[PDB]
Amino acid sequence: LKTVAVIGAMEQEIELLREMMENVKAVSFGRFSAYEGELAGKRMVLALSGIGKVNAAVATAWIIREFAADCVINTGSAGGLGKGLKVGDVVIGTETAHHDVDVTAFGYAWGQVPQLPARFASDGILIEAAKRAARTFEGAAVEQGLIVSGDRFVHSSEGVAEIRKHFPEVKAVEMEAAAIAQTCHQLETPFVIIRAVSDSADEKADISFDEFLKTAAANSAKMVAEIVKSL
Amino acid sequence: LKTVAVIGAMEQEIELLREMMENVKAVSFGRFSAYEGELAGKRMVLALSGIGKVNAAVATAWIIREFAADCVINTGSAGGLGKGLKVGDVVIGTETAHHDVDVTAFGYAWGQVPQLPARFASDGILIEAAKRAARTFEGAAVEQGLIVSGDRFVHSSEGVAEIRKHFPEVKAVEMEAAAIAQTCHQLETPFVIIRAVSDSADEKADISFDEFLKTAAANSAKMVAEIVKSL
Ligand SMILES: CSC[C@H]1N[C@@H](c2c[nH]c3c2N=CNC3N)[C@H](O)[C@@H]1O
Numbered sequence: 001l002k003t004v005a006v007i008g009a010m011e012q013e014i015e016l017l018r019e020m021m022e023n024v025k026a027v028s029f030g031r032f033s034a035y036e037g038e039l040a041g042k043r044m045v046l047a048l049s050g051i052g053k054v055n056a057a058v059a060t061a062w063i064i065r066e067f068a069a070d071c072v073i074n075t076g077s078a079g080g081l082g083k084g085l086k087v088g089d090v091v092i093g094t095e096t097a098h099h100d101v102d103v104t105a106f107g108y109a110w111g112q113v114p115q116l117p118a119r120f121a122s123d124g125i126l127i128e129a130a131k132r133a134a135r136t137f138e139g140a141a142v143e144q145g146l147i148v149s150g151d152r153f154v155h156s157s158e159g160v161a162e163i164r165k166h167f168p169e170v171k172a173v174e175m176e177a178a179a180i181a182q183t184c185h186q187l188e189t190p191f192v193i194i195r196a197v198s199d200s201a202d203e204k205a206d207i208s209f210d211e212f213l214k215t216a217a218a219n220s221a222k223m224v225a226e227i228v229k230s231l
Numbered sequence: 232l233k234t235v236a237v238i239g240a241m242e243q244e245i246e247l248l249r250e251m252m253e254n255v256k257a258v259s260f261g262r263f264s265a266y267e268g269e270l271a272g273k274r275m276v277l278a279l280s281g282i283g284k285v286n287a288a289v290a291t292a293w294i295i296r297e298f299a300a301d302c303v304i305n306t307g308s309a310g311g312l313g314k315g316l317k318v319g320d321v322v323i324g325t326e327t328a329h330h331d332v333d334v335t336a337f338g339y340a341w342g343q344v345p346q347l348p349a350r351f352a353s354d355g356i357l358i359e360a361a362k363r364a365a366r367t368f369e370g371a372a373v374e375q376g377l378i379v380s381g382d383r384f385v386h387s388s389e390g391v392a393e394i395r396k397h398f399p400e401v402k403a404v405e406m407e408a409a410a411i412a413q414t415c416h417q418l419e420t421p422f423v424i425i426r427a428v429s430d431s432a433d434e435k436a437d438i439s440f441d442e443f444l445k446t447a448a449a450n451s452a453k454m455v456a457e458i459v460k461s462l
């Protein structure tokens with residue numbers, strides 16, 4: 001873990017981390033942008049992927065290729081579905097899955113992309129680093145568990161019920177984590193997903209999201225920065 | 232266009248093209264494999280993406296970045312939604328959109344990734360090449376129009392219903408083209424999508440696909456090889 005890649009979807013989700021970096025250098029690939037520098041004593045490349053699975057996948061593949069990233073950490077906001085979660089709480093995604101993949105017609109489990117596992121496991125070392133960071137993390141409650149992704153912003157009770165039917169133990173929902181996870185799997189690169197709650201993915205999710213994005217972004221980022229220091 | 236990238240999801244969709252190529256070198260990037268050779272005095276890099284949006288997007292970005300591809304052509308099978316489409320018929324995808332993207336909560340149009348256009352237009356020069364290629368297959372059935380993609384295999388007369396609701400003029404549905412399109416958009420690369428019908432995306436789509444993949448792959452491939460010769 002020499003070079004750490006950190007991927008966030010939206011500017012609000014990377015700004016704090018960017019302000020924390022030293023010797024920052026802007027870099028880009030077509031329309032994607034990133035920032036190369038250091039945090040703690042670690043080389044870090046912080047990328048802005050844009051929203052959704054294709055954007056996150058391409059950005060992640062780029063940083064891995066271009067910078068030989070040793071691991072990848074996703075940061076940002078998400079819909080909270082876990083028992084007892086509140087706005088600002090952080091979830092360490094120990095497993096990630098696509099909630100909107102369905103090739104069941106050919107025998108695959110719901111969410112399973114053909115030729116791949118149904119879920120993607122975050123790296124054991126990185127999970128461990130995140131758990132250690134949680135032990136002294138004061139800004140918010142932290143939990144661990146499953147985060148699922150798909151190419152939609154979920155904002156209905158019916159939408160959440162669909163996802164819980166396939167993923168009963170789900171803790172959070174968003175739109176990039178499973179794409180980043182699947183990309184790292186395919187590129188044999190360890191990763192972990194860190195997200196914080198901006199909403200409940202329910203009928204009010206869009207209204208809550210815009211209000212709580214900055215708080216979710218910050219809490220997620222502060223956890224991510226603790227992890228990087230520890231590596 | 233001197234270096235052409237050709238992207239197919241499945242071995243069966245690239246096998247003929249691979250056999251047509253000369254001076255072929257195998258290349259890889261993690262679990263992704265491609266073949267760099269020549270076809271008709273063009274440099275061709277033929278990539279096996281794997282199924283679905285993440286896989287297609289990563290393989291496409293990799294080939295653009297590593298090989299400096301001048302354009303990208305997708306080849307493969309798709310479910311026929313256009314009126315009258317038969318197994319084996321080819322669709323030149325002139326426009327592409329994601330059918331399963333939904334950030335409508337924040338005002339975006341159905342299918343539209345935030346900050347991206349709702350649909351992605353294939354390159355004019357490539358579409359005209361496809362149209363010339365089509366005329367060389369005398370009698371053959373070739374149409375032009377909208378192809379939509381999502382991370383699921385459609386095999387339901389009502390799954391189709393709902394797609395048609397959002398995209399009335401839709402001609403075909405599959406799982407990679409909009410990811411390739413979006414990736415090319417973001418990396419400023421011209422592309423065109425060529426697919427052939429393996430099924431009608433209804434309840435029999437699975438058995439139709441199993442039987443007619445070889446046919447759809449072949450017809451798509453032959454069209455793509457002729458397009459390469461026309462650039
Ligand atoms: C503006 S779209 C939502 C962005 N924030 C994340 C997220 C927060 N809350 C939700 C998100 N994604 C889906 N459903 C939700 N309820 C997603 O990963 C997107 O990058």
Ligand SMILES: CSC[C@H]1N[C@@H](c2c[nH]c3c2N=CN[C@H]3N)[C@H](O)[C@@H]1O
Pocket residue numbers: 103106240241281282283307308309310383384385386404405406407429430431432433436440
């Ligand atoms: C084995 S999954 C189907 C593969 N073939 C394509 C396709 C054929 N027929 C359909 C596909 N995709 C979605 N719905 C369909 N009815 C997709 O792009 C996948 O790569």
